[PDB]
Design a protein around this ligand. Structure first.
Ligand SMILES: COc1ccc(S(=O)(=O)N(C[C@H]2CCC(=O)N2)C[C@@H](O)[C@H](Cc2ccccc2)NC(=O)O[C@@H]2C[C@@H]3CCO[C@@H]3C2)cc1
Lengths: 99, 99
């Protein structure tokens, strides 16, 4: 699709076998969800946003179904107020900014 | 341009007559700079994201140029770790996210 930016750009994704909604965020390096169940082991990570740092669990090499593609990669989980799809995921579906 | 997202999507931006750089950020509602000085009065605003909240300085009616498109927009000034171009400004230059 071509997404204009008059409203927040949300997409539906499947993660952990559940349908979730997340914000396409080209200013986020990483993909971050709250309240989901990922496979495998995780390691602790801290992420620094506009207001300070956030403690998360990092799950490497897990699947996200997004834009009709299986993307395997890193997903962070923590008490973010909004689920976000970052560049780590968007590069795998060939997303671009066009201006 | 059509840019990919393997690196952070910084663009050159002229804001209030100063040459700066900022991230094209689809997850940002508004444009926020840390390293500019805009003249006159300002309205206080609170904004929030990962890690917490910050107080910013709302400056109204500010000239902004990106990739040759000159627009007049709202710019927030505050202690953001990285300058961001938000959706308000991106809609004015006709930017889209594509996949
Ligand atoms: C009202 O206008 C604004 C309000 C908040 C923001 S924000 O910077 O907090 N943020 C809002 C996103 C996050 C929450 C939401 O619902 N939308 C814009 C983000 O793109 C932000 C922009 C950003 C802010 C601070 C540092 C780097 C980029 N990136 C970000 O938080 O990424 C996280 C932090 C980690 C560093 C970058 O990637 C890692 C994942 C920007 C404008």
């Amino acid at each position: 699709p071509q997404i204009t930016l008059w409203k927040r750009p949300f997409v539906t994704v499947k993660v952990g076998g559940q349908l979730k909604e997340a914000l396409l965020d080209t200013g986020a390096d990483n993909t971050i969800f709250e309240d989901i169940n990922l496979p495998g082991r995780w390691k602790p990570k801290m992420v620094g946003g506009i207001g300070g740092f956030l403690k998360v669990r990092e799950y490497d090499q897990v699947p996200i179904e997004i834009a009709g593609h299986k993307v395997i990669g890193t997903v962070l989980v923590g008490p973010t107020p909004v689920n976000v799809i970052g560049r780590d995921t968007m590069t795998q579906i060939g997303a671009t900014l066009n201006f």
